[PDB]
Symmetry: D2
Subunit: 284 residues, 4 copies
């Protein structure tokens, strides 16, 4: 399984043509699962879920979708509230590929997208697995912006190698996972002019007049499916106090917290994460 | 596997002879695991872990120990702080059976016993699985006593069938698990004169001058092993806000919360509980 | 100041004529404040604020309003979502009295009414003082219904003096505040056919298709005024964990918690409450 | 009242002579109160309480004490656990001044010192007012070290004006309180070799084998006096989640939280803090 072997494109309509890049594996497995990556600079499906796709494709038909503005999907200079824009793109892909009701796995930004999708198109979303998710998290104790959000803003204003490294260090509990190669690789993807365009256009959409659609902690009492929340105890981006409203209000919620784990659960606890996701989604 | 086929006795020394009753299954399985039951009236190993022993004995050598004052273990009229008394009895059994370092699974009262044991005899305790545990729980938001503790006290003062039923109803989210047969069975065991003696002697030991040994939320930063905390979201005895100090201070802690689940996790989520315990303790 | 000297009536139109009883005091004083009582069986303005009205009336022009269904206000058998119903009546009274923008003080149910008024008529509500308020509270840890709400429901089904005394005793930390005289007086008002009609109507009102109107924790991020939340640490009706979403999301929030205090802050900590309220609303 | 008019020295024995600087005001007033400042680089009594001393001195006999390592008190290179060291010095000063039982007001580090004094010399501490206190705080959700503590550590390693300004800016909600004059004054005191010697010594002092002395959240259940905890909702040094164990376990606790307020409550909310403190300590 490689970037190239799994790479797929689709054209969907969201206020005009929109190119979506995704990865496909485990074709023929009975159960399809959609993976939605996190929102850090230079993030994309393949790099986000590298320690996971190969393992999950043993059990599931995996579609790992680059959200609009990331990886090889379109990087428009302007859009509405990001999670609803991303959910509309996903609905386009579901319709194009003929998907019915499919479970979603969403990390950070992609967890917000998974939830907005499950709220707006309730019959198309199955079980959700959400890792340090945006949108449905509200940090009842942590002052906003958090250390993780501040370092992301600083990179967006001064997109240097040093500021990217400072951002990546507050993603993980074990700062040795932040290797020169990782930094070099992510900096290379994050600093292209169209990636910077996509990241700037992000800032105006969470901060713009469309903000209420982002406040999904207000709405998740409506989710009817089982939802597994997964958190790193040491998450410095979306800290653990953000899980509480969703745990309380989602009728069939579950929460799993890993000690000695930051925001990148799927990396730092990759094995325990894969096993929890496989069991929760029904073993395939 | 039956009560009778699995039933075992040992005599250990704790301020004189003490008869311990336990159940044994999965003999010859490489990995021994000790189960410690909850503290409700008429509680014991076999009835507490009926939906679990058979499944766990497929993977582990299971010892399910009736704690002093419960089931067929000795029911003394007097003892010190209960968890240290129970941990001393367990240390006696470990020494008698030749056990080295063994993982412990503890529900409620038995979770407090497992923790006191792991603190006082650190080289004899392996991984801990703690379900709505006493001792290391401190309800930061819930006023004490909780609804569950109050109904237990009321039964202790007026040990009637009606007061036992009211206690058992706040153990579970789905009140239909509280069948006439369950009530009849538990009432029969709970209302014997020596069981009432054991339950009264309990009240004077958590409330007596030995109370600090009970406050194990103060001490669990010392645990060096992986610890899996398991909670019912709707636990009305030891509610979910009691998990927070242990989750924060145990270095290798994990927490799993089940929505639509009360204090009896091992009953209401028996399947998910068995699977989590099997994976966490290493699959056997 | 007496019940009779302060008594006033007004008629307002809320899907038809609606009689409202209120108490007026400190007519000399420039700053008006509206007081909205808690919602237990037999509650009313004069008794709910008996330790507060005389002290506040030295500084403010006090309007203590019997909410629809309570005291000498009309007790219809049918109405929509209670807090919205009571807020519409209060708004009718504001228009009749020629009030513009006025601070509100609200205990429990009255706190819910105050918040619904401030959200629906934002230009008419000044500073809010809310004591153990319903509506904006969401108990992130406590299983619902709480011990307090269950006792209130038991009285609705079986309106006996014993069930009312049991409810009143979980209202307060110091159970000696629940004197035989208080129980006899509240029970005499609560047990009338008109009051019980009101009590049941209010119940039904909270679980319709307008349930969203009761979930005010979703909306208080829009409040622009200073808001003083006041809680008893030992509130067993609306416990302390219910304060967190409001404290986080109300921009100019403050929280005062009293140890050794239950749900009736204005009674149990009357002197500290009187002083917090006078200072917060500007000393008059 | 001036720095010079109020200035006083005393010598006490704490493993050898120890010079203590303090400010004395309101000598007429019957009720003594001891003020203990926060612990940032260059902090001292006069500047830390500059918005409070004159107001409190109208009601109380004020003793504002420069803790060892700060202001004009001795700055040894070596000492044990800081709060215990500072508490021993204060106790030496109580004995020299002939004080019995006196209320203490403590910000941050000074809050930690106040609590250690009240635990080690229980008959000598009256009512406690603690603002964003160290020592009794345990951040149940925030990963440690917090943003605030990390900025303080960065200054210890690289004591520049830029690193001090960055630290001071995470101390407060309203960043305009961090004026060029304030930064220049604090930095001039913090950068002296004596102060930096103190700053580093204090660091080392917290991670010895006497670390348990710093974990005061384990011990404050033993405090018998009223304790007013005061917090900024936006404290990024000792965040709000650090209040919970103390509020739960101190029998006569109260908590006041201020929205739009960081770690320097006595500065950012000086008027509300002055009034809370005067009323709590009995008006003098
Ligand atoms: Cl860092
Ligand atoms: Cl399902
Ligand atoms: Cl019940
Ligand atoms: Cl291990
Ligand atoms: Cl105002
Ligand atoms: Cl006192």
């Amino acid at each position: 399984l490689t970037f190239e072997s799994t790479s797929r494109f689709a054209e969907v309509d969201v206020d005009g043509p929109l190119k979506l890049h995704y990865h496909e594996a485990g074709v023929g497995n009975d159960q399809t699962v959609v993976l939605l990556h996190g929102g850090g600079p230079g993030a994309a499906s393949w790099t986000n879920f590298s320690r996971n796709i190969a393992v999950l494709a043993r059990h599931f038909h995996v579609l790992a979708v680059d959200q609009p503005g990331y990886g090889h999907s379109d990087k428009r200079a302007e859009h509405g509230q990001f999670n609803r824009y991303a959910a509309m793109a996903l609905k386009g892909l579901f319709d194009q590929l003929g998907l019915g009701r499919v479970p979603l796995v969403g990390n950070s930004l992609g967890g917000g997208t998974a939830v907005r999708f499950a709220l707006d198109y309730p019959a198309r979303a199955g079980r959700l697995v959400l890792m340090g998710p945006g949108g449905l998290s509200i940090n009842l104790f942590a002052p906003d912006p958090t250390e993780g959000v501040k370092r992301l803003s600083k990179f967006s204003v001064a997109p240097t190698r040093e500021n990217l490294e400072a951002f990546l260090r507050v993603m993980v509990y074990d700062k040795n996972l932040i290797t020169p190669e990782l930094v070099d690789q992510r900096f290379a993807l994050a600093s292209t002019p169209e990636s910077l365009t996509a990241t700037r256009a992000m800032g105006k959409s969470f901060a713009g007049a469309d903000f209420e659609a982002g406040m999904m902690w207000r709405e998740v009492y409506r989710l009817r499916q089982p939802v597994l929340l997964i958190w790193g105890r040491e998450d410095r981006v979306n800290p653990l106090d953000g899980a509480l409203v969703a745990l309380k209000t989602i009728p069939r919620a579950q929460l799993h917290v890993f000690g000695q784990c930051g925001h990148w659960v799927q990396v730092e606890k990759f094995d325990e994460f894969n096993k929890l996701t496989i069991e929760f989604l029904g073993g395939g």
